[PDB]
Nucleic acid binder design. Structure first.
Lengths: 119, 139, 119
RNA sequence: GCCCAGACAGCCAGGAUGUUGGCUUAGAAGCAGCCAUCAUUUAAAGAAAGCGUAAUAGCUCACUGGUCGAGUCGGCCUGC
């Protein structure tokens, strides 16, 4: 399949497949020619959702405006952008930070009265 | 304005002409060897006369050139750490000089601007390989 | 399309992709009806390894070194790394991203003067 | 011995940095010869196995990635 379908096929996978895939990306030709996909598949967000940890907004609760403030301060988005990212709860509040940052972001959000998860 | 080149190697502070070596090279790319010489041995007059510093120079956009004398330490002091003048023709068989552990980290760090290696222990194990293949002993 | 073909299709699909599906199914049928495919889609083994597209490099253009830099920072790969992964257009940039990600990865490369596709 | 957890060979692109390594040599800067043959960035790249230059340059190989997706490679013996 086109390389622009395999790279994705991977992303689709989960800890199970990625491991089954990497465990299906080795011996055939040793860990040598396997390190390529191994070191590439390793950086799978999960173990870093540093160790890409993001923040998901399960719900804002009754304190919507409160949750908005936290978002407008973390992401820096406008009033309309923030509320739009909290109402429908598009999850992805911000990704790329570290475990400490995300753990902190989640904390700040929870304080506002919002339920957050860490994939 | 679109015509531009770039390349330059080490040059002894004070030497330039005649043509060989620095003659046809960087001489048919736009810049002449006429000047550029006094624009070299006139800016590097306050350091060590025997310091082959690889100054970086572009080429031209009109006719002229440019000059940027950078920074030896490095390469130098390493050859002057175990006889630079008198060296062993066939290194590995014998020695020429010696260096302590202190003077092993000295030349180190003072060149990290060219050696991108994490940790200092990794920095030590680089000039320890480049340590010698032309005289001098490890310890 | 044959049920078996659909199963194989989904296996070839991806997260965000099947998400656009489960979301479309959720918007079309509902959280109740689309619950079947939703609870069946997620198990793309599952926990989510994480997230779907790809980031193939159709051509690095004249700014090879430019495209290299972008790849070096995205894939964490060093200098010589992106070198080939950009010249011969090996395509395989980084597998394990979603829309906002792959779309961004594409943007980042396009800015460097590189033609990238998203399939 | 290497083989369908994408290699061994094709095709595409790399094959680098100190360094024109030291010595020698009219000159030899991977590639007359004489001794070493480490280190660097790092997916790979021997201070370099060949062609080539007066000396450079240039062109390949080793090694690695993508693609190609299948029989391929070194070797011993016997018949005409």
């Amino acid at each position: 399949i086109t390389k622009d379908q395999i790279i994705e096929a991977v992303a689709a996978m989960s800890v199970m497949d990625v491991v089954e895939l990497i465990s299906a990306m080795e011996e055939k030709f040793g860990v040598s020619a396997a390190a390529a996909v191994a070191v590439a598949a390793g950086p799978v967000e999960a173990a870093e959702e540093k160790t890409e940890f993001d923040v998901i907004l399960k719900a804002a609760g009754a304190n919507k405006v409160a949750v908005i403030k936290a978002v407008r301060g973390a992401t820096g988005l406008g009033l309309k952008e923030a509320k739009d990212l909290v109402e429908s709860a598009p999850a992805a509040l911000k990704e790329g930070v570290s475990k400490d940052d995300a753990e902190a972001l989640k904390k700040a959000l929870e304080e506002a009265g919002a339920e957050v998860e860490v994939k | 304005k679109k015509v531009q080149a770039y390349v330059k190697l080490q040059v002894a502070a004070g030497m330039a002409n005649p043509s060989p070596p620095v003659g046809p090279a960087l001489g048919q790319q736009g810049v002449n060897i006429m000047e550029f010489c006094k624009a070299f041995n006139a800016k590097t007059d306050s350091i060590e006369k025997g310091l082959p510093i690889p100054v970086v120079i572009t080429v031209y956009a009109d006719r002229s050139f440019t000059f940027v004398t950078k920074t030896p330490p490095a390469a130098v002091l390493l050859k002057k750490a175990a006889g630079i003048k008198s060296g062993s023709g066939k290194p590995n068989k014998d020695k020429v000089g010696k260096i302590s552990r202190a003077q092993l980290q000295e030349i180190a760090q003072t060149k990290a601007a060219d050696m991108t290696g994490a940790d200092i222990e990794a920095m030590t194990r680089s000039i320890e390989g480049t340590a010698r293949s032309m005289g001098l002993v490890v310890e």
